[PDB]
Amino acid sequence: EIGRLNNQSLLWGPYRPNIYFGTRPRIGKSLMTGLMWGKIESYTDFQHTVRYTCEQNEGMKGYGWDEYDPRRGGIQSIHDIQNGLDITTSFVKIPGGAHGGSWAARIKGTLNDDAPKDQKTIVVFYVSQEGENSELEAVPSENEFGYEGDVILKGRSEALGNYKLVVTKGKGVIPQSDHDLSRLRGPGQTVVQSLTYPDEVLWQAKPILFQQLKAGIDWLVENKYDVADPPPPWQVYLLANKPGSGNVHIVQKVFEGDFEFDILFSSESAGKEVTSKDLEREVKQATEVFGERFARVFDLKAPFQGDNYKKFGKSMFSNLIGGIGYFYGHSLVDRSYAPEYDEENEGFWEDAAEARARHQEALEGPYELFTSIPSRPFFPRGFLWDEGFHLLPIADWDIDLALEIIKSWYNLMDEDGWIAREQILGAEARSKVPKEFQTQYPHYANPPTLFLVLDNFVERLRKLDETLSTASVDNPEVGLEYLRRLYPLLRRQFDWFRKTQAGDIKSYDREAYSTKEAYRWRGRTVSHCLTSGLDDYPRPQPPHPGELHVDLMSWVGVMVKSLISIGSLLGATEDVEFYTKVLDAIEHNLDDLHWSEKEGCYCDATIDEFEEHKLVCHKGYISLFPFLTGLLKPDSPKLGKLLALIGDESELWSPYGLRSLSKKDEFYGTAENYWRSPVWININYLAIVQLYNIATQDGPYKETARDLYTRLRKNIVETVYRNWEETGFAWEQYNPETGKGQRTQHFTGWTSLVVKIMSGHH
Numbered sequence: 001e002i003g004r005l006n007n008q009s010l011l012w013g014p015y016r017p018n019i020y021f022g023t024r025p026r027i028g029k030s031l032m033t034g035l036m037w038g039k040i041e042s043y044t045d046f047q048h049t050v051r052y053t054c055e056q057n058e059g060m061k062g063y064g065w066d067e068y069d070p071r072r073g074g075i076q077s078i079h080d081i082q083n084g085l086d087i088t089t090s091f092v093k094i095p096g097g098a099h100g101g102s103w104a105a106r107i108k109g110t111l112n113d114d115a116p117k118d119q120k121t122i123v124v125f126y127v128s129q130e131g132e133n134s135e136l137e138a139v140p141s142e143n144e145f146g147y148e149g150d151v152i153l154k155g156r157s158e159a160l161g162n163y164k165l166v167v168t169k170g171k172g173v174i175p176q177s178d179h180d181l182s183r184l185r186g187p188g189q190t191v192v193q194s195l196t197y198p199d200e201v202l203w204q205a206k207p208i209l210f211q212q213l214k215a216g217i218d219w220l221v222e223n224k225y226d227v228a229d230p231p232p233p234w235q236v237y238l239l240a241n242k243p244g245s246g247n248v249h250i251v252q253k254v255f256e257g258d259f260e261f262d263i264l265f266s267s268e269s270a271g272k273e274v275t276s277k278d279l280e281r282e283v284k285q286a287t288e289v290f291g292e293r294f295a296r297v298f299d300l301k302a303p304f305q306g307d308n309y310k311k312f313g314k315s316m317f318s319n320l321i322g323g324i325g326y327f328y329g330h331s332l333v334d335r336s337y338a339p340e341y342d343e344e345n346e347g348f349w350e351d352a353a354e355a356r357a358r359h360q361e362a363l364e365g366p367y368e369l370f371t372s373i374p375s376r377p378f379f380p381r382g383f384l385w386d387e388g389f390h391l392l393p394i395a396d397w398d399i400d401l402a403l404e405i406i407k408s409w410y411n412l413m414d415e416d417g418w419i420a421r422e423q424i425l426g427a428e429a430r431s432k433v434p435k436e437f438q439t440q441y442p443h444y445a446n447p448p449t450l451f452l453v454l455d456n457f458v459e460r461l462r463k464l465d466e467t468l469s470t471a472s473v474d475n476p477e478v479g480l481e482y483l484r485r486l487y488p489l490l491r492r493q494f495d496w497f498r499k500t501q502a503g504d505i506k507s508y509d510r511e512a513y514s515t516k517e518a519y520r521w522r523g524r525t526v527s528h529c530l531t532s533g534l535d536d537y538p539r540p541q542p543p544h545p546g547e548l549h550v551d552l553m554s555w556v557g558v559m560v561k562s563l564i565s566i567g568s569l570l571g572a573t574e575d576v577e578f579y580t581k582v583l584d585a586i587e588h589n590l591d592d593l594h595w596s597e598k599e600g601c602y603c604d605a606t607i608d609e610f611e612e613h614k615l616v617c618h619k620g621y622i623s624l625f626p627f628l629t630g631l632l633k634p635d636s637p638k639l640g641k642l643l644a645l646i647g648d649e650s651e652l653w654s655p656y657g658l659r660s661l662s663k664k665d666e667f668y669g670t671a672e673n674y675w676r677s678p679v680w681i682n683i684n685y686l687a688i689v690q691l692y693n694i695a696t697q698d699g700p701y702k703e704t705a706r707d708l709y710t711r712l713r714k715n716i717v718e719t720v721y722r723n724w725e726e727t728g729f730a731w732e733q734y735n736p737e738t739g740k741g742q743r744t745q746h747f748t749g750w751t752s753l754v755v756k757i758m759s760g761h762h
């Protein structure tokens with residue numbers, strides 16, 4: 001019942017973060033829309049200037065959400081240098097009826113100071129509908145060659161019932177052609193082309209548009225329009241009007257100078273149809289609500305209480321929550337469980353490559369996923385351990401939203417307990433991913449950081465849009481039922497980890513409190529360990545079936561501590577007893593297998609040339625894991641030595657945050673130098689939260705933790721703020737020597753954790 005209200009609230013959104021601006025509902029095969037625009041200055045330039053899928057290069061100053069809440073809508077701003085255009089896309093949801101409500105958008109384009117004042121810009125609104133028993137029709141024009149006013153599309157489906165979608169006339173100069181062609185094509189007006197293609201290719205908006213433009217050009221060629229006397233470019237690239245029935249509708253406008261137009265989606269089962277007056281008003285309302293929620297949910301503490309930090313927090317937050325996508329389709333999975341994937345022998349990476357080279361992978365599904373993403377331009381899709389970080393701030397904002405996303409993720413889990421770490425769903429998603437990197441492998445794990453979110457919900461539980469956001473904490477019954485239904489999958493994931501990611505104690509000269517607790521990440525190559533999330537952090541060389549990884553064991557610890565709390569809430573006492581013994585064994589086994597007294601930190605372990613357990617110690621993030629994951633007692637002498645490592649400028653401590661790897665480590669700044677020195681916000685965030693924990697409890701390290709917490713919070717926030725101020729972007733990682741953001745931009749993305757770091761009061 002709370003489920004039905006949530007379903008209905010979240011159904012519609014701009015859930016296509018892979019494109020600048022578009023809408024889809026959370027339904028695999030339904031109605032989608034996308035925006036395209038580009039300046040036209042010549043006969044050949046439109047194909048190069050036209051924008052649709054997100055990218056980041058010299059031609060685009062920046063883009064992002066100024067404001068967003070997926071229940072209500074928001075405002076995105078796009079700063080396009082190539083096309084001399086500052087664009088604004090406002091989207092708003094209007095609840096009502098039985099079909100997930102109505103929505104509207106305003107597209108406003110303003111030429112920048114550099115653009116020719118008489119620039120011609122082509123704007124397209126592309127609309128598609130998949131589904132066997134559904135209809136969509138453009139109501140024809142009264143006029144001869146196109147539309148003087150609004151374009152109305154009428155459609156129906158099982159999912160949406162009856163609806164109307166209107167593209168309004170809009171404001172702005174419409175250029176007029178004196179050419180001969182105008183007698184056949186009109187002087188210049190809004191046009192509509194209504195087409196049909198087999199459902200599975202409808203997503204290919206750009207090629208479909210261009211095929212129509214080319215047919216347009218070929219008609220000119222056949223009909224004696226030539227270089228003797230050519231029509232203007234904008235008229236050459238203006239489609240001949242042919243509205244009708246189909247599963248594809250192209251709405252094209254040309255504008256000279258500034259422009260704007262509305263898109264009004266009117267769910268028939270609701271009240272009166274949506275108007276532009278409705279849009280303007282609900283835009284203003286949504287802004288007020290966003291304003292008030294922000295100040296309550298993300299109340300930035302000293303020294304970030306100022307307005308500059310507020311605007312920064314709003315940008316980082318809105319971009320993260322604005323990344324929410326709905327994805328649908330088949331994924332590519334190797335279901336061969338080839339025995340080479342067991343990696344039980346020396347040299348196992350060569351065996352595994354030989355297996356992969358059998359190419360037994362097949363598409364399977366379809367699946368759906370509702371998730372936030374790291375990067376609109378470079379990787380707009382679900383990543384398993386990233387989502388754990390993304391949901392930390394989102395959960396604060398709207399716990400029901402976060403729980404929905406968690407549910408969405410767990411619904412992917414297969415019978416054995418595997419969720420693919422990278423969710424590439426459907427041909428549209430695949431288009432952005434080289435074939436060689438699509439295949440998922442059922443023995444590949446990723447950190448279970450979604451348990452971190454679950455933990456915070458549990459603590460919240462112990463201690464209509466306003467209502468709906470917090471319904472899962474405000475009605476303990478609802479909360480518990482949610483945990484009840486998820487609990488088995490959580491448990492299945494726990495079991496899967498210990499089955500598939502088991503390390504080898506019993507087979508070597510290995511003494512420890514427990515014969516059981518030992519873990520090794522499957523999937524390592526000579527240079528990489530992708531499944532751990534820390535691609536190129538240095539690990540034992542060469543890789544070896546005897547390896548043990550202290551990060552993985554610490555994640556199993558995070559998991560088991562969570563199972564304790566959740567089981568304890570559902571009174572699964574047979575389960576809670578078992579967990580209690582596993583936790584106890586990991587605490588002991590962390591020390592017995594992973595602690596280096598001589599180095600003063602945790603290390604991964606291998607097996608020698610001589611068949612004996614060797615620690616292989618590389619000072620950095622990995623070394624801190626038991627502390628980052630909240631496993632050490634606040635009086636632990638090991639914790640204190642870890643605090644020395646963290647605070648030590650010659651090892652990890654840079655002015656800009658903690659270095660992934662110590663400056664003393666032989667691998668510092670080597671090779672791709674991905675996780676071999678740069679400052680990464682996700683691990684810094686875990687550190688900051690654990691420092692705070694120790695700083696707010698009686699113990700011997702209280703005052704040290706307090707100082708490190710104060711400084712690290714400051715350093716991390718200021719580095720990310722400084723870069724945002726100067727570049728407009730959140731970055732993937734930060735240079736510890738210069739403080740510059742580097743690798744990819746638009747990383748929102750766990751970089752956005754900074755809103756919560758500024759927020760404090762963990």
Ligand SMILES: O=[N+]([O-])c1cc(N2[C@@H]3CC[C@H]2COC3)ccc1NCCCCCCN1C[C@H](O)[C@@H](O)[C@H](O)[C@H]1CO
Pocket residue numbers: 374378379383385386432433434437533534535
């Ligand atoms: O998508 N690609 O497959 C892909 C595409 C391309 N492109 C080609 C064509 C378009 C596109 C842009 O330019 C040329 C280039 C390289 C790759 N490589 C796959 C790697 C995926 C990124 C992992 C980022 N993070 C790494 C963190 O280490 C990990 O912790 C984190 O979880 C993960 C997620 O945030």
